């Protein structure tokens, strides 16, 4: 088919946004609630938040990679 | 009024025809050798005239005890000022004229689209009236928020305002933020930069899409059943116009607040 | 003239607007007037 | 067959909006609850909240730009 | 493949409604729950809540915009 | 395909009523729970609740509108 | 390609019933819980409960009303 | 094709199961938790629970009846 | 085509799985938590829990039936 | 078109995994939390927990069975 | 079409990952919270976490093995 | 009908990101919340959290494997 | 849609509106509010 | 660190199949799964007799490790049902002690490499190598000699069916004719849930067998694929995850067997 | 295919039964006896 | 052997990966395990 390669990039980027987006949302919400409940642990909590975001962000990055493997 | 309405079948008699109103751009109202007066510029001028008229009516005397229209204007202005003071402390005076003018203007623009004859009254260039002749019918009084030009203009003016005040508040550092951190504010910095860049586009598109969808929704509900069916939708639209105005004002001011800090 | 009028659409819009205004005056008339009068009284008493 | 590019733009934008919208919604809800429970910590919370949004919306932003690269 | 533009418009609007709708619901529920737990924080909560309402919906608006571009 | 317009209008309605439906459900549940504690606050949480609905329903409305622009 | 219309019908009742349904659930659940904590507010709560349903069901009703139009 | 009607009835039944299934789950979980919290009010909440079911299940029935129409 | 009946069978079974699966999960989690918070009422809620399942899984059964018919 | 039986097998297995997976996750999380809150009841909880799984996982198995009917 | 086997493999793996991923996330979060509340109950909470994780991940494993059979 | 391999790779990557993304988000949020309420148990829960991640990411890794088995 | 003359005219009109309301709608009402607040 | 990820020497493809039959010249054919089952039977028996050959106080060495593992399993099963923890212990202990070493044998070097046959060579511009196999001659497929025992749907199905038979027998052992009372009892709504529970009990052995076989097969195939992508330093974390998940699956197979037995008896 | 050979299935079942009995008579019984001795002679 | 067939290069990769995994496990998961075994045997020594 003439298309079907733009659709691939679209699907990859979109679903890589679908998953990690909610993942980061839940991570930040829970972490910030923990900050509010117990302020003096903030530092530790913050670190884990970022770590979690990384373990989530990479997934979206993978999707982007697929786009760069088709868009380019 | 009972729920046993028999006029639910008014489309048999009053058939509005297909929703011919689907133009997602600016339509010229008057042909002039200079710049063309679009259907949104005329209504923007009308709303400006109405705003100035109410301002001079409530400000010709400035009575100590507020009564009549002066009380209404004072109430709305005080509510907006209290909201802005809640959002930010010292920059209320700096942004108040812009963020209150934008609120009033887009509010009256949104509420104008619901006026009867907005989608009906028009100029010759089911079958309306003009289509009977050779000239097509183009409607008059298209709400300024429904136009993409006006929304883009107010969005870009808000963007310039936010950037200028953030720069003036935080020195040259605001221009570069803390990109030199390289530990945290390195990948987040570009993310915030692109977010700020797309902020005016979202700000304009929210108003444009909401008002366009409201207008086409009213026309569509007239197409389906043009009696007692679009009353709840009329209520929803008269609510959502004011809500969109307040959201736009509060949002530009909150973006200023997050820019300075 | 060059006046373009859609009869059915204009009639429907006018009827719907009148009904909405009537229902608003039925509902959103006492609260707004009461709030205005409360603000007026509060400001007046501060004299 | 021929309009597949439009389907690609639509899929990219829609799927990019599916996830990050819920993510930033959860972020804002958690941050607001944290403000309500402990107003004093509010400032800190807010910053992290925005940081989270900065991440989450970014994914959606990516999808948007993909549509541009596809539609344009 | 006639009518593919209509399918693209439908997909864009549908997914844009899918994501930010739940986002807005979660934001408003969290805000009203925080207000109910502590009324006094309302003045400091609502504004933040509205910010979220104007973030998630923004993504949805994006879809609508793309839809209009696809439709028109 | 000749019938793709019907599938488009069905997707416009069906996909557009997914997010807003759950959003309205969450908003009303949160408002009712916040009414359960401190009934005197009932007024305010109602206001925001309806405001929240007026956002979520708006998204669904878009979908509906688009459907009537395709089906009709 | 006649049968496509049926598929459209299937979507309109189908997808349009997956959004409101879940939402209705949450509503009732929340309402019931609010009745459990404070029985004396039940009446008012019940009101808003039904009000919420009257919105969500409406969305599903939309998914129904177009479906018959698609079927007919 | 000659089999698109089967896909239509399958989709209708499947999505009508998708929505009300989670709706019933949430309703029953909330009702059971509220009963456990306050056994005395059990009867009352039970009624509302069933009412809630009678709403969401209705949506499923609609989808089901569409299959019954597609069947014959 | 030829495999459209198989696709319909798969769609019906899968979607009828995804709905009532989460429904039953939520029901059992809520019932278990209520029992843990109040063992004495356990018996009562247990019946209700099963009743809830007897509805939720019922939906899945419908989907399965649609398989057995399409599968003759 | 080539064999659609592979696509049918994929859809059946995938959706069967989609639903009961979240169902089992919620069941186990709720049961573990209830046990941790009130250890004295753990055995009883465990019983119902497994019962819940015995239902939810069953749905997924159905999909798998359908796959082995189509794949084979 | 021609390469539908690849699409089938992708769909099976993807949806199998979709379901049990959220299931495992919920299980681990709930069990960790239960351990944090009552550190003494960790001994059996961990075992229940692991058996629930196995139950959930079995579905993703079924998806992966089905896709491997389709792929190979 | 030709470039279906790209669509398959996109689907695999996207849905494998969809599932484990939310899984990791929930895991990290729960773990950090548990840490906040009980700091001295942090080292006891973090491992479990990581263990949970090592499972969820695994599912996503599976998708990536397929993306490198059909994308090659 | 993106007519530069049109949005430039709209931007100029909006700037003129905010600069005519400040000296007519905002300065007088803000002065009145300042007098009222300074009165207490 | 990452500069040594040379793929100039790597496998040509990813060979994937179910259990493959060995030569089997006489009757009663034996497969690659039923040579590793025998080798792990020998390993487990030798380990047991080594731990047993000298039993005394103060355990240390093999006996200490065996006692620790056995008492950990005993405590794990006791927490579920202390009445049958000793009546059914041999089955749910041998299941673990066999499946664990079965899964851990698949990770040993040479699994999927030695077969019985019943830089320049690698392709450029590709991330995976294309070096052929030793028994490319005669056009053979190089049937692997060693496979994971649980990676075969025959051994895993066998352990699932023996577990199901054990559960059914010892639920029938002490319940009276109460099984007919748990299912289709026509106690109002209890009849439907009883039928569903009977269906679940019927599909339980299938679920166990499919779960274990799929997990082990997926682990081995992921290892082969990761080796294909990058021969070295890529499948290290995946090897760690695979050994962990093999031990995990070995444990939860026995755990689920005993849990189902407990839910049957009570 | 799946290769579910009934002969191979029976062979695996018999091997597993023999392993069960051998371990019960060789490992589980002596170790349980020693555990009972060291937990009841305390 | 007339029947033995060995992958020339995949076997080397498997060997290297397994050796690295064994070394890493001995570096990390050999001290806690030995510590637990020593604690258990010392507890049994104390009990006797």
From Swiss-Prot, chains A, D, E, F, G, H, I, J, K, L:
Its main location: membrane. One of its GO terms (biological process) is proton motive force-driven ATP synthesis. The record marks 57 as: Reversibly protonated during proton transport. It is a multi-pass membrane protein. Pfam families: ATP-synt_C (PF00137). InterPro entries: ATP_synth_csu_bac/chlpt, ATP_synth_F0_csu, ATP_synth_F0_csu_DDCD_BS, ATP_synth_F0_csu_sf, ATPase_proteolipid_c-like_dom, F/V-ATP_Csub_sf. It is found in: Cell membrane. F(1)F(0) ATP synthase produces ATP from ADP in the presence of a proton or sodium gradient. F-type ATPases consist of two structural domains, F(1) containing the extramembraneous catalytic core and F(0) containing the membrane proton channel, linked together by a central stalk and a peripheral stalk. During catalysis, ATP synthesis in the catalytic domain of F(1) is coupled via a rotary mechanism of the central stalk subunits to proton translocation. Key component of the F(0) channel; it plays a direct role in translocation across the membrane. A homomeric c-ring of between 10-14 subunits forms the central stalk rotor element with the F(1) delta and epsilon subunits. This is ATP synthase subunit c. It comes from Chloroflexus aurantiacus (strain ATCC 29366 / DSM 635 / J-10-fl). The lineage of its organism: Bacteria, Bacillati, Chloroflexota, Chloroflexia, Chloroflexales.
Curated annotation (Swiss-Prot), chain M:
The chain crosses the membrane at residues 1-20. Keywords: ATP synthesis, Cell membrane, CF(0), Hydrogen ion transport, Ion transport, Membrane, Transmembrane, Transmembrane helix, Transport. It comes from the Bacteria. One of its GO terms (molecular function) is proton-transporting ATP synthase activity, rotational mechanism. GO terms for cellular component: plasma membrane; proton-transporting ATP synthase complex. Signal peptide: none annotated. It is found in: Cell membrane. Its main location: membrane. F(1)F(0) ATP synthase produces ATP from ADP in the presence of a proton or sodium gradient. F-type ATPases consist of two structural domains, F(1) containing the extramembraneous catalytic core and F(0) containing the membrane proton channel, linked together by a central stalk and a peripheral stalk. During catalysis, ATP synthesis in the catalytic domain of F(1) is coupled via a rotary mechanism of the central stalk subunits to proton translocation. Component of the F(0) channel, it forms part of the peripheral stalk, linking F(1) to F(0). F-type ATPases have 2 components, F(1) - the catalytic core - and F(0) - the membrane proton channel. F(1) has five subunits: alpha(3), beta(3), gamma(1), delta(1), epsilon(1). F(0) has four main subunits: a(1), b(2) and c(10-14). The alpha and beta chains form an alternating ring which encloses part of the gamma chain. F(1) is attached to F(0) by a central stalk formed by the gamma and epsilon chains, while a peripheral stalk is formed by the delta and b chains. Belongs to the ATPase B chain family. This is ATP synthase subunit b. It comes from Chloroflexus aurantiacus (strain ATCC 29366 / DSM 635 / J-10-fl).
UniProtKB/Swiss-Prot annotation, chain O:
The chain crosses the membrane at residues 2-22. It is found in: Cell membrane. F-type ATPases have 2 components, F(1) - the catalytic core - and F(0) - the membrane proton channel. F(1) has five subunits: alpha(3), beta(3), gamma(1), delta(1), epsilon(1). F(0) has four main subunits: a(1), b(2) and c(10-14). The alpha and beta chains form an alternating ring which encloses part of the gamma chain. F(1) is attached to F(0) by a central stalk formed by the gamma and epsilon chains, while a peripheral stalk is formed by the delta and b chains. F(1)F(0) ATP synthase produces ATP from ADP in the presence of a proton or sodium gradient. F-type ATPases consist of two structural domains, F(1) containing the extramembraneous catalytic core and F(0) containing the membrane proton channel, linked together by a central stalk and a peripheral stalk. During catalysis, ATP synthesis in the catalytic domain of F(1) is coupled via a rotary mechanism of the central stalk subunits to proton translocation. Component of the F(0) channel, it forms part of the peripheral stalk, linking F(1) to F(0). Belongs to the ATPase B chain family. This is ATP synthase subunit b. It comes from Chloroflexus aurantiacus (strain ATCC 29366 / DSM 635 / J-10-fl). The chain holds residues 3 to 44 of 164 of the full protein.
